[PDB]
């Protein structure tokens, strides 16, 4: 065999105090959707220019929305579509859609999804890409049942749009038969790669208190109905963190313990790299919130904020040929 692994560490400073970060690659430029919060709320679209983020625009200014909305960003090859959806309790859901073909100019208008399918489901902000389902591309907005006590099965549900997020009349069925009774699900988000749909989410322990990552793979059986199944990534004395794919093989991140003093990255469960946030000399710092930002079949970033304002960017190249 022929293995090539290459990593480098770059830093990025942000002038804006971000509450929740959201990363996306667009035309091999790195972008962030920063959520800011005695002052006013903002939803800044930023771009890594050299070693700094640069605020490009504030989408929140352009909408008459209140408080914190859910954010669903979709990056097609040449177009970016961002949706700011109000957070709860009406029959239909109001959202504000933004479109751009470049990183710079976004045009907006308010849309409404009447009698939307995700009533009383829990949603959470995420970045995604179109999912091809039998010669049609769809954008997905997915939700989860908070908790359950009667099992009949319905637990995960997606409303989808094949008209660039204008209308959300499509319903994608997710049969996840391993859904547990008596536990609460937390930050569901679909991981999409080459027409294959998967989900990454958390489950809230009852014997303990910590949230636990779960990752399920779905196979497409009938048109618009997927059947999912849990994927075992368990590793003794390490906590599962983020999941991505490179080379049609999984790349998985782990923390040493629930404090994330260290992070290990495994390539196809065969090779690993250690990330110790002791670089820069910043002693009290970890890799909590470390996520993958895929950029190619061979390249991906692993980003986390070691401290307030500091962004640690690990550029990764992997090739198993």
């Amino acid at each position, epitope marked *: 065999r022929h293995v090539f692994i290459r990593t480098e560490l770059s830093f990025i400073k942000n002038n804006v105090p971000c509450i929740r970060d959201m990363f996306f690659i667009y035309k091999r430029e790195l972008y962030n959707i920063c959520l800011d919060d005695e002052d006013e709320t903002h939803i800044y679209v930023q771009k890594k220019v050299k070693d700094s983020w640069i605020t490009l625009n504030d989408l929140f200014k352009e909408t008459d929305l209140t408080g914190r909305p859910h954010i669903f960003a979709y990056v097609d090859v040449e177009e970016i579509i961002i949706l700011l959806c109000e957070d709860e309790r009406k029959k239909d859901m109001t959202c504000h859609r933004f479109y751009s073909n470049d990183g710079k100019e976004y045009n907006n208008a308010e849309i409404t999804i009447s009698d939307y399918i995700l009533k009383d489901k829990l949603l959470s902000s995420y970045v995604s890409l179109p999912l091809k389902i039998e010669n049609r591309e769809y954008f997905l907005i997915c939700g989860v049942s908070p908790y359950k006590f009667k099992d009949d099965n319905d637990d995960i549900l997606c409303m989808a749009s094949h*008209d660039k997020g204008e209308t959300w009349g499509t319903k994608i069925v997710i049969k996840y038969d391993n859904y547990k009774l008596g536990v609460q699900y937390f930050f569901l988000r679909p991981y999409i790669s080459k027409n294959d749909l998967s989900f990454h989410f958390y489950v809230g322990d009852n014997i303990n208190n910590v949230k636990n990552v779960n990752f399920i793979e779905c196979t497409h059986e009938k048109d618009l109905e997927f059947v999912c199944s849990n994927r075992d990534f368990l590793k003794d004395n390490k906590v599962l963190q983020d999941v991505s794919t490179l080379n049609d093989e999984y790349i998985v991140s782990y923390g040493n313990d629930n404090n994330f003093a260290e992070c290990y990255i495994f390539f196809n469960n065969e090779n690993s790299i250690l990330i110790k946030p002791e670089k820069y000399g910043n002693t009290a710092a970890g890799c909590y919130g470390g996520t993958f930002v895929k950029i190619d079949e061979n390249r991906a970033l692993f980003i986390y904020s070691s401290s307030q304002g500091i962004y640690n960017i690990h550029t990764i190249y992997y090739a198993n040929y």
Partner: antibody
Amino acid sequence: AVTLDESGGGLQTPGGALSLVCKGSGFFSFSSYTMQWVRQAPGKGLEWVASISSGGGTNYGAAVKGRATISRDNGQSTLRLQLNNLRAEDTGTYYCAKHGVNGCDWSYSVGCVDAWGHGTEVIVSS
Amino acid sequence: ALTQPSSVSANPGETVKITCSGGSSSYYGWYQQKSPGSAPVTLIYNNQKRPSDIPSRFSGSKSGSTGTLTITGVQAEDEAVYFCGSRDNSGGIFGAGTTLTVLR
């Protein structure tokens, strides 16, 4: 390449209703194109009338909201416009229009249209 | 509100530009109408895309809230009304039309 063939025009009585039809031909996945109606009053410029997205999203120009209904039948590659309570401002030529395969920012945008019909003359007159 | 000049003149061979300013859109389109009867013909759509059987002398551009149609090497048959199309918060908008006058 597609063909857009409009019918349903002619002399109409004021207050009456208009029913235009557009029979598309040579489409490949007609269901996935935003279809539109554009009109042009005699000696005036072009004016957007209505749009229907691939997912059924309809939008209407200010001069026709509340009087117009745009619909499509994907199985037959047809687009229809129904316009009731006709008035003199509704006189003009109505064109069937289609956006490119990639579509654009908004279904109601008029800067992505890559195909037009031959048009049908509508004359609201007593 | 799309604003375009009412008229533009050029000698055959010259390169002429028609600008259309306005609208809150990502894309501009250029439609040519030869006679007031004639159905429009898309010359450029989605800023720069050119439909088949449109000569390569027709070019499309976009710079901010502005769209530009460029005719490189004007011909006598390029005489026509050029309409620009775009999007606004009020729906689809069109320009008033620019008349190209071939000089002789």
